[model samples]
Target: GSSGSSGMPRVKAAQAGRQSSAKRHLAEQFAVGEIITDMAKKEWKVGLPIGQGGFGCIYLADMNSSESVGSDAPCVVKVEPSDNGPLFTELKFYQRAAKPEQIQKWIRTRKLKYLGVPKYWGSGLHDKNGKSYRFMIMDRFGSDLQKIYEANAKRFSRKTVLQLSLRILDILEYIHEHEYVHGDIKASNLLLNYKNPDQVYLVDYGLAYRYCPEGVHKEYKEDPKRCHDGTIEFTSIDAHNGVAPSRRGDLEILGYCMIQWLTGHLPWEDNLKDPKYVRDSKIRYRENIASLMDKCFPEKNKPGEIAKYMETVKLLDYTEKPLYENLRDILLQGLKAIGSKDDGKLDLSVVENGGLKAKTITKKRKKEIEESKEPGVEDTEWSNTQTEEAIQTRSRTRKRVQK
Candidate 1:
């Protein structure tokens, strides 16, 4: 499944109308109680439309098994147009990065009960009216970080931020060790498990790329033309340059997520409408370390814990392994500074409590979430950021799209 060269094509906004029509056509074609077979020949009964993204539609589904028919637990199905890039990109990720043996090896070595990734149920190529579609089945998840963020008034305590950062870092470390970078690392992409709120899973590997294949080292280069390739506000500097995402790039994006979640805003957030302004502002923030530290931690003049963590990661070269232990220590120290205990546990009760503390939300937004026909569709709109990748083989060039 690892092409080791080219990946999915970059999808553009101009193609949305066509994509929408295609999705609509799919909606008309699929119905509840339809049984679909996977590559493994297992059958799943479609339930209802749960979510829709630019490239795919998600559905609640059930396995027609004797033991699970009366159970409340359900699986999810993501359907993509036959030509969509994200569907194949995700399939490749599960094939290479999420193999069960690989995960078990990491768990045995790390001595952790949870690995913070979804269980791949099954997948297959399906067709209707001569149009083939790709579908994947996975365990269902609850709300995402974005939903929880809105409910919490767009803020979290320093302790909660540190706890989240540590958990995500564990996930990042595992993926980096497997030679992949989750090109998009943001609040929206982190999801809560339905059964265990404390366990968070990193979803959406569509933007993922293999940086160093086998034993090869990735080189450093910059391309200003592709600098605006990721999310306007939090994309890594390397991503701005259109470099294939690497271990350092993943850490850099995580750094931005921590800063934004801790402060509820970044210096460039207000200028997000203008992608160039956002990119330039991030560049300036990186160039002036002291200024970034000051703005991100306005309460103090010296470098804050997050600033120190960014400084440490910013110094890493392409393909270099991040100092995971040292980075975790930075967050651990922040937790200690906030008078919080380091019991090596996560507390999502903070999110639940924050939801209760919600002061207000727009009537329209709340209504959309409450009255929506789809079970899993978020009321929030999707960002227009497009994924781009430039990979170097021993000789040829490979262009890929981030899902």
Candidate 2:
């Protein structure tokens, strides 16, 4: 009876045009020195408003600052109107899985040098101007991976690429164990430490979902709902098929990120206007990574571990827990292939691949990628994407999925 109205919300969302500015009331900016307290009953002084997120403003933050949070403020606070939607969900994720002591314990037990997940400092509600606002504190980061990748001619050196993914794998493992899937995994969401360039952190949990709650993996169905929900280029094959995001989807997305990070483009990026074509293109490529490899590299030598990684992830079942070490081992093998050690040094250098040619793009895309340079927060925003009707016409079933 109501089939016509079932898709109205997303249709409206796509029409809005300002990157989902179906934009809830933009959280009012906080005045410098505005103090906010957290659920832990601790106080933090909000400093300069450094950047704005999709739903809120991020401010320089500190403890007992006399309104003097400087350029080097160690932490930043993200504040959104109390009634805002994604912030609440993001805050819940941080509170549940991103605590400081918890991260430290995991690091110590593993004896790892560091983990890429940001430590959740604190969060609480503040009533100001007769309005309610929610705030969270976390370490301030330096440069985001997107900006870094763009700065270096849209390619990460093979050594640098391996270094970044090793840490990303560690972060993904921890977060998945905490039972959530970061539905969006791209360069922009990955940020480097403010004090340490080598240490990168994954942020912006806006699309992350509790795929497996309380230990039961999210059951896979043929085509339940929520189609084409993330960045079209790197979103999981399951997402393209209208399946809920799961562990394998996260790894697949990571594989795409590695592919994009190594080369400047995914082969279907030009056809992004057609989501079904993009979805089917990915499926076709995934079927024989040789085709994917040739298309992505196009006569250039391809990275070995990336194809290996893709093959390994393709073997994963929708509900199968990926052997995290096996994935890490795959990446570590990537390092040895480069004659590199498992050292934490991120060269942050651009290497010339004499044989590689980056795909040229329109000035519009150049501007879109150029403006993604801010440090405080990354968008949960998707690009000019359409609704499920965008794909239903061509889908008999996910050729990638079997019921």
Candidate 3:
């Protein structure tokens, strides 16, 4: 069993390395060698640190000005120790989410408004005297969903929330249909491609799990609090209990993120103030929460008014609620389900992203004009301006390699 704050949840032993069954697992999943060069003397035009976590750091990097990639395209390179948890999560994220069935059917066939998760351009490893270090290459994007929500607090709207939830579920349902848990579901893990204002891309699979595995598995170890990895604010109760990631856990975390996206706060953030069990149990509702799931997030604005809103959103049966209401309700149900204390390990059916239902895929979508290889697909024609004529852009930081 994993506590919500545990370092990325432990994975199923059987499904730990099955990348191929899920096409997205293998196709887009890159090795470190795919991106970097061996020579350490020649410095790449590495920029400022994008962000840092307990696991590792992310940096904006560009090969030397002379090291052209045809379009002068720059990318983000996430570097981590080869043995770290994020590396496993990243690999699993690509493998589990991009399964051929998922990509070919839901993404390509439905022509969903948003493209699936981030494309795994390539992965590389650099060796220093035969010791290896790993790094991942991703096509750089402007900002993350958390930052967007923070910047546009007043501007965030119901329509946008529903559109986002529906599209995300469309993607998640695909992941879940095959069986997987996006263990690190959070605002920061969402990236906004410049293609559209509302389009959200799920990133950083360093905490994902492949739900489907080869055989009956043992239960995960239960921690005192939660997994050391993944955001604590977004974890479901079962996740907090140390149970392996589940459909409900994934939905619960997704609900938490969506609600925060809509309401700007988590229902239980205030309740988690103290480490004491009495205080923790107050808002936790039931030790076995699923039974009274509908009671926690009621919309009545009563004692647990904030919680009421949580319930109204959760027990929502998809009868005929408006799109906006539908999104709210879906999240509410997930939140309610999250608190359900289901013990005894859920049988994970897939093992690529360590028991998460994700398929790793390298995507080139027609919907994304900027990511397009052939420039003339859309009717609007544009001109390539001279590089010198454009505003000069330069980096202010340098890469801090492991010494």
Candidate 4:
């Protein structure tokens, strides 16, 4: 019997590419807000409109060699009508910014799963409203984390959340290590090239900037009356102030995202209904965190508190909580602490399932020291291969291999 051709691995490549091409075409049609026609110059095949916002639309487009200046590199083009102010700001910032490249280089050196940011593909102006409209060109890749999150029903498993958190922290640390800040951090902004899911290709560098301690002096920090921008739930508390993005702001937002990922509920989501409301709400909390923290304080009878207590929780035996209690009581206390915000200084940084304490010898400070220590030359690879092999052997019928 002949092997079915359908089972072949690569036969689907061209077909899949074609399908993606078709999707791109439809996306371009949507972006242009009109039927696409063969232009005067080269033919441009459109890909799906991967992203959108109030100011401009980003469509995935494929153009011919004539349009590309980079030695036949297939160009993925980004289109936006130039009249849009925010869109133009984004384009111009990218055009002149040195920070994006720095972030990209840092990720590359870390040997991380994240790919460097997408390369600038090509940009152009389109004739609209009887005048030329500005647009940008960029290299294309795969879909984004937003779609992945949506497909997963808007929440991720604990393991997935942890992985994302750690990787994102690494990225943020790298960015923060430099003076730059990824101003607008959101699920929708992360583009995931499927060739390697680990290879995170961050897109939408529109809000990214070097941390300006004073503020974004380049432009008025949005209209004072309507300064609201960025995705609501994912934006940091500090960002709403028209404060230039900073490391603390990025991590705070990432922390909020982590909380949302873990709980599927956002602490400040209600504020998102209106940008003004979000701004005001952020301001209120900023002025007095004591009030907001009071609201999150644990209650004895609340659902979150109750549910938390009901679950078995491992406790830290640190001198911090030296009181003795039954397993149930211990669990209840842990629950109360986690669920309530009254503790004000509660730290959730420890391992959840493991009954590990923040011991003086092995807490965050000690762990940082250990991580900093370099392994000795004798402590090299291949030292544990035999141990791994021995462990893999079946206990009942273990057999020795030739030495």
Candidate 5:
């Protein structure tokens, strides 16, 4: 979604709230082989930049070697001017919550195949041409869901939708347990792994909100200036009310994405330009999950799991912790009701997934890091980050909610 020929992707990205524009200084591209060192004194030599947009550029990078960094770099070095807060805030999220060891601990202890949260490697400040810059190293990612979604003519099969949400539920649970909320959840920010296509990753923490800090949940308050702050099409009703995003808000956003992925249209999508109209529509629809579900799925074989899932999320209080297991069970049940199993393999082969020609990860998994050298930042792991358990009698409990 680059701006045409005007050459200011920064201006466009800033306006979309993809990147902050605070005294935004353009990152003068670094010549290949200029090395930057992270806080732990780990040196990384830059390769030719692989991509650039918004307020920063990403270059192929590797550990300091007497030999120049190879084209097959395992990591990415994201560089931006020091004045920029986007990368700074992103670094904050990664440092505090997404350390490689921390993520792996959650995966191992929970007995899960994988978690989709991207791994943070290292970060530090640098200086050049009389100006300061900030940089961080992260696992190189592959193509985003936006590309795959567009290729499939903008709709996903029920299997694909449920499976994708299942993986994302894993991500949301981990982040929330660590006391943060992803303010933006959309196809563009969800990426497949560079080494593993079956595995998905949540990238871009520019809008990540720390709803809870040091075990304290932030109060429910709305700031007029921050009203309607997230991606409009998937914005939560709380966001429309100028409220800070919470656990419920993240699930609400994910629910909307699942609907759009399945039906290729949201009831309020056409009215995005009018925030109040979108707000009203979300509130009205939220008041009746059955109405919203019927409008999207229709009477002919409606997937009740989605309506059931939304109803469960709609019950959360503003500052409450979500029952992660119940939500995962909802998606797991969706897969079962559709006769699909959570088979660890991503069957994006519905119609033409553009061959799942994921450009960066068109192909699948290869082992990279078997052991991590860096230790974690020492936040105690949550007891609740367990794998999905057996589903309870959902239909039994669900009937009583409405009647």
Candidate 6:
């Protein structure tokens, strides 16, 4: 008999390093524009490889069905070797987590219609050039939150953060209600829709699993061998102890994400190479956030709402249901303390129209100022002059339109 995390596949150390090559080799077996047929005899025309990860390579594909062959109905195909780790685990999780009934239950509970989870398109096993491959098709997303975070200088407005926090919490709570824990909840896994900036989706269910079933609970124990099994800086204490990820763990990870987004960095980030050091630092930071408050926030003694919430999370037992409303109130309290409106409405317009615009201008102006002193600076200054001239032209056009 063997024991493991309920919803996640255990990847051995030896196989982890070899999986990338296996997926790459497997993907190469299929040519671009190759039409692969699923078990239902539906055809998908492979276009180009879009992304690659530990599991496999993903490709842009066009469904060739009469109802979906139009240019509007494009999807992404995730490919991996059948033996290494397939999309089966993820697909199974989606089968339960992404069902229409489950989604409606969440929407009905919150009176919100969307759960920020991707819809499953289709999936199947295929043999290409005598090699077995597993693939799952899903809606393509525009960009991951990591890229947006970097482009925005790793900072977001309080309202933006609040909205993102609430939305992600909704996703976590919804999945947890269905007996799943998204063991990995990081910026890279949070993505925006292709057409909507306001709509964010949680991607990558490979690390998700059922921590407990109805009327069942898992015991708490420490296993040094499985400690630090997840992303080092934000992995939960339960994860650090080799126990399965529970609901509290998801909230803990979310707490870390909120702190990082607000502060730009975590106190444990500098010690990431050593997981134990990071884990220990997190433990200490949770106990006394004031010690690191200066570095974690721009305002010296700002409301430590996120810290307080995390502190509460740190005390929860393995099987205890967290106080979701209390935790959300902690954040809402921070918003009010910061003088942001308490109406529970987020204004993305502030971020889209002000912060991002100013960032772009500042970044461009800084580049020009730097190049203005260089030896071959004339071209750079000329480029700046052209930009100014274009702005003047646009201003004139606006004035004329106004008149």
TM-score of each: 0.71, 0.72, 0.52, 0.49, 0.72, 0.68
TM-score computed on alpha carbons, candidate 5: 0.72
lDDT tens readout by residue for model 5, 259-325:
7888886757754677667767788877777777787877886677787778887786753558778
* Clash totals in order: 3, 0, 79, 12, 0, 1
Query: 1-403 in candidate 2: lDDT tens per residue?
Result: 5575456555342444563112212234566655678885888876665444464667777777463444536787777766766777667777776777787888888877687667787777788788887777877775577778876677877777777778788887777767766546677677777645457787755455575333435555456244434557566766655565556776777777766767776656544777667777788876777777666655666457777877888777663668778888888887987888887776653342473433653232111234547876876777797566644565565556565
Judging by lDDT against the true structure, name the best candidate.
5
TM-score of predicted model 4? 0.49
Q: Give the higher-lDDT candidate: 5 or 6.
A: 5
lDDT of candidate 6 over 60-127, digit per residue (tens): 66865332222334577777766654366578776677665666776787786767667666676688
Better of 2 and 6 by TM-score: 2
Rank by TM-score (best first):
5, 2, 1, 6, 3, 4
lDDT of 1 by residue, 72-181 (tens): 33777787657666677677777666666666776888786677657676686678889987898777776677766665567765666778788888787777666666
lDDT of 1: 0.65
Clash pairs for candidate 2: none
Q: Where in model 3 is the C-alpha error above 4 Å?
A: 1-57, 60-71, 95-106, 113-115, 154-156, 194-198, 204-206, 212-231, 243-245, 258-262, 270-403
Worst 10 residues of 5 by lDDT: 19-28
lDDT of prediction 4: 0.45
- Which segments of model 1 are wrong by more than 4 Å? 1-27, 65-71, 212-221, 224-233, 243-245, 300-303, 317-321, 342-346, 349-403
Alpha-carbon local distance difference test for all models: 0.65, 0.68, 0.48, 0.45, 0.70, 0.62
Tens-digit lDDT track of model 4 for 86-141: 55554554554424464356555775434334555334655655766566555554
What are the root-mean-square deviations of the candidates from the true structure over C-alphas? 19.3, 20.9, 24.4, 29.2, 24.9, 25.4
Model 2's alpha-carbon lDDT is 0.68
For model 6, the stretches where C-alpha displacement exceeds 4 angstroms are 1-27, 65-71, 84-86, 105-110, 206-208, 213-218, 224-231, 243-245, 314-320, 336-403
